[PDB]
Amino acid sequence: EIYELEKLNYIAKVFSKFVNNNSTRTRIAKLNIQQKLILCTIIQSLKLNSDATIDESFDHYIKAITKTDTLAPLQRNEFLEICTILETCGLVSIKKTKCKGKTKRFVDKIDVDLDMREFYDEMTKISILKPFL
Amino acid sequence: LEGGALVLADNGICCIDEFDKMDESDRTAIHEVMEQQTISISKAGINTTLNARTSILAAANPLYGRYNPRLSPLDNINLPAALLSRFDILFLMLDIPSRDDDEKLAEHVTYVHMHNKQPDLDFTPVEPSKMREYIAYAKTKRPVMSEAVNDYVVQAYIRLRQDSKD
Numbered sequence: 167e168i169y170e171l172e173k174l175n176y177i178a179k180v181f182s183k184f185v186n187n188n189s190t191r192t193r194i195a196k197l198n199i200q201q202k203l204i205l206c207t208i209i210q211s212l213k214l215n216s217d218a219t220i221d222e223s224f225d226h227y228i229k230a231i232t233k234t235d236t237l238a239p240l241q242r243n244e245f246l247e248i249c250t251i252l253e254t255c256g257l258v259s260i261k262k263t264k265c266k267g268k269t270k271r272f273v274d275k276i277d278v279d280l281d282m283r284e285f286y287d288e289m290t291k292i293s294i295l296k297p298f299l
Numbered sequence: 300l301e302g303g304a305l306v307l308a309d310n311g312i313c314c315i316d317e318f319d320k321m322d323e324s325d326r327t328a329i330h331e332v333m334e335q336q337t338i339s340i341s342k343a344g345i346n347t348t349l350n351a352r353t354s355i356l357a358a359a360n361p362l363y364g365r366y367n368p369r370l371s372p373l374d375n376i377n378l379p380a381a382l383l384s385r386f387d388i389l390f391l392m393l394d395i396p397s398r399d400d401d402e403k404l405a406e407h408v409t410y411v412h413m414h415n416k417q418p419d420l421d422f423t424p425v426e427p428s429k430m431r432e433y434i435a436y437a438k439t440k441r442p443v444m445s446e447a448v449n450d451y452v453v454q455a456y457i458r459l460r461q462d463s464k465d
Contacts, residue, residue, distance in 0.1 A: 235462035 187257060188284045195255040199294065200237060204248055206295055208258065208278060209285065217263055217275045220245065234297040249276075300344055305332060310352050318359035319377055326382070329355065333385050357386075366393055 168176060187195055196202045204227070211218055211226045224245050231239045240248075252258050257279060262272035289295050305313060305328075315321075315329070332338055333355055339348040361367070361375050372391075376383065383389055410418055417424055444452075 232461075233465060238458075 187255060188280055191255075192257070192280070192284070192288055195252065195257055198248075198251075199292070200240075201248060201251060202289075202292065203236065203295060203298065204245075205252060205257075206285070206289065206298055208249075208276065209280075209282075210298070212278070217265070217273055218277075219273050219275070220249065223249075223276075230298060236294055236297065305338070305351050305353060306349070308351075308353060311354065312356055313353040314356040314358070316358050318357045319361075330382060330385065366391075 193202075196205060207227045207230070208218070208223055210230070211223045214222075216222070221242075224242055227245065228239050231237065249258070249260075253260060258276050259279075260274050260276050263275040265271050265273050321329075328338070332351055332353060336352050337348055337350050340346070359378075362377055367375055373380075407418065410416075
């Protein structure tokens with residue numbers, strides 16, 4: 167019907183839907199240079215391999231941005247919207263995981279589909295994240 | 300009572316070549332006229348004060364001659380925090396070898412060693428008397444800051460203090 171719509175061609179059409187953002191279209195997701203900064207900020211918080219909250223990420227985001235003054239520290243509410251820009255492209259997923267203090271209480275743990283090998287290529291082209299590593 | 304180099308040069312430029320080659324006795328007297336223009340000396344000869352409005356120009360080199368990128372600048376510079384904290388402008392005139400920019404310095408030194416004339420740019424170098432007269436005419440001016448520049452000054456100072464405040 168594609169040759170009716172235009173009045174293994176399609177398997178070629180369907181696999182590029184799935185393979186990309188890690189090799190090429192990562193920078194498509196982060197046209198904002200701060201979105202590049204906030205993406206490395208998540209991985210620096212992943213050293214403490216814990217329930218990666220949006221606050222503990224915001225903790226490491228402030229305490230690094232006071233050391234290197236690349237930008238002003240932004241809001242948590244801004245930090246809410248910017249990580250959702252990272253979300254809709256399909257890079258990082260957010261789930262409401264478990265903490266069992268009072269009830270089944272839902273803090274948000276993130277997870278990234280990128281590796282440091284596919285990170286280090288796209289950051290050496292920008293020496294402004296080079297203070298942050 | 301004989302005198303040094305800070306007393307015959309009262310109102311002007313006092314320069315120091317090889318700043319790190321001096322001692323503590325020179326530094327304690329240089330920092331005293333660097334903070335405020337009055338020197339006071341109380342020795343077996345006299346206990347007196349004297350003023351000397353001077354502008355300190357200093358030329359220094361690091362600990363190992365040249366710089367070190369693996370070393371911090373607080374460790375590269377042997378001067379203490381109170382000395383360069385009083386210094387508002389410090390110029391890190393560092394040389395970096397390049398391919399394109401070194402040729403202009405080489406062309407300029409061969410042009411001034413070929414003859415005394417300067418390069419053929421569309422500008423003429425002014426003689427010492429005219430800008431000496433301009434400096435003497437500009438020195439009587441007393442500028443007053445506005446409020447629109449005041450709100451930019453305090454915001455830049457707050458941001459610089461927070462950025463500087465490792």
